[PDB]
C-alpha cells in the first residue's frame, strides 16, 4: 500500500469533515435567519382561504347530505349566486429570489474551489472500491501521478463526497426537512379552474349506508375503566 | 313520549356561505399521461447528449439529467401507474 503521512489525517481529513458539518449548519441557520414573510393583504389570504374551503368541500362533501352539497355548489359556481364570477381583480423581488435560490449550491462550490486551492497537492484517502480510470482527472486534482490507482482521491473530491454524505446527518440532528442541502400568484385562472373542477365533481353522501354498516358489528366498549 | 320538549321557534347578515332556499340544482387519458414523460425524457436526453464537452466537464449535470426525467420515472413507476 502507501505509507501516507499521519499529519494528512490530523490537518486535511478531519478539518474537511468539520468544515462541511459546520458549513451545513451555518447555511441552514443563515437560510432561516434571512427568510422573512412577505406582507399579504386581506384579499389574497381571503381568496386563498375561500378556494381552500371550496377544495376541501370538493374533497369530502361525502359526509354531508346531498342538499347541503348542491347548495354549496350553487353558492360557489353558479351565475345566479354571483360567486366565482364577481371575484377577481432589475426588479428587487426577482433579484432577491434569484440570490436566495443561488445561495443553496453556489456557496458549496465556492468552498470546494477554495479548498482545492488551499489543499492542492495531497492524497487524502484511498476509496475502498475500484473506481474507473476515466475518473482520474477530477478525483486526483493537484496530483502529478500517472499510474496511481483511481481509488486514491485528492482533497476536492473528498470534500465533495463529504458534502454528499452529510445531508442525511443534517436531517438526523438538525431536524426533519432542514434547509442545508444541495438539491396563488393568479386567482382568476385559479377561480376558473376551481369552477370547472367543482362543476365536474359529483356527490356521494357517505352517510347513505353508515347505519347498515354499523348494525353489523357490536360497538367497541372495553377499556371503559 | 312524556319529555318531547320542543326548543324551536324564533330564528331571531346571514353567515357567509349560507343559502336558505332549498335549490334542486344538480388508453384514453392514461395513454396521454404515459406518453407525456415518454416525450419529455428524450428532450433532456438530447440536451445532455448535445452538451458534448460541457457534459464531460459537468459530471453532476449528466447525473441530474439522467435522474430527473429518467430514473425517477423508473423509481416512481408504481406512483406513475397509480396516478
Amino acid at each position: 500500500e502507501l505509507l501516507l503521512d499521519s499529519n494528512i489525517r490530523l490537518w486535511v481529513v478531519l478539518p474537511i469533515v468539520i468544515i462541511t458539518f459546520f458549513v451545513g449548519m451555518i447555511r441552514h441557520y443563515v437560510s432561516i435567519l434571512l427568510q422573512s414573510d412577505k406582507k399579504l393583504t386581506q384579499e389574497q389570504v381571503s381568496d386563498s382561504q375561500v378556494l381552500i374551503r371550496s377544495r376541501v368541500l370538493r374533497e369530502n362533501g361525502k359526509y354531508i347530505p346531498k342538499q347541503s352539497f348542491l347548495t354549496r355548489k350553487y353558492y360557489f359556481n353558479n351565475p345566479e349566486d354571483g360567486f366565482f364570477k364577481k371575484t377577481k381583480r432589475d426588479p428587487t423581488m426577482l433579484t432577491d429570489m434569484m440570490k436566495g435560490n443561488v445561495t443553496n449550491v453556489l456557496p458549496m462550490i465556492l468552498i470546494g474551489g477554495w479548498i482545492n486551492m488551499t489543499f492542492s497537492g495531497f492524497v487524502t484517502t484511498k476509496v475502498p472500491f475500484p473506481l474507473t480510470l476515466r475518473f482520474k482527472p477530477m478525483l486526483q486534482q493537484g496530483i502529478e501521478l500517472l499510474t496511481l490507482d483511481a481509488s486514491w482521491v485528492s482533497s476536492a473530491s473528498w470534500y465533495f463526497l463529504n458534502v454528499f454524505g452529510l445531508r442525511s446527518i443534517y436531517s438526523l440532528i438538525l431536524g426533519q426537512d432542514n434547509a442545508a442541502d444541495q438539491s396563488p400568484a393568479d386567482t382568476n385562472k385559479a377561480f376558473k379552474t376551481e369552477w370547472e373542477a367543482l362543476e365536474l365533481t359529483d356527490h356521494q353522501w357517505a352517510l347513505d349506508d353508515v347505519e347498515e354498516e354499523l348494525m353489523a358489528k357490536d360497538l367497541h366498549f372495553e377499556g371503559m375503566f | 313520549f312524556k319529555w318531547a320538549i320542543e326548543l324551536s321557534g324564533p330564528g331571531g347578515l346571514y353567515p357567509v356561505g349560507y343559502l336558505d332556499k332549498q335549490v334542486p340544482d344538480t388508453e384514453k387519458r392514461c395513454w396521454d399521461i404515459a406518453l407525456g414523460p415518454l416525450k419529455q425524457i428524450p428532450m433532456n436526453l438530447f440536451i445532455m447528449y448535445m452538451a458534448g464537452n460541457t457534459i464531460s466537464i459537468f459530471p453532476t449535470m449528466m447525473v441530474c439529467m439522467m435522474a430527473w426525467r429518467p430514473i425517477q420515472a423508473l423509481m416512481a413507476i408504481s406512483a406513475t401507474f397509480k396516478m
Partner: peptide
C-alpha cells in the same frame, strides 16, 4: 478558478 467555472456552468444549466 477553472474548476469553479466548469462546475458552476452545470449549476446554471440546472437552474435554467
Amino acid at each position: 478558478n477553472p474548476m469553479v467555472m466548469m462546475m458552476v456552468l452545470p449549476l446554471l444549466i440546472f437552474v435554467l
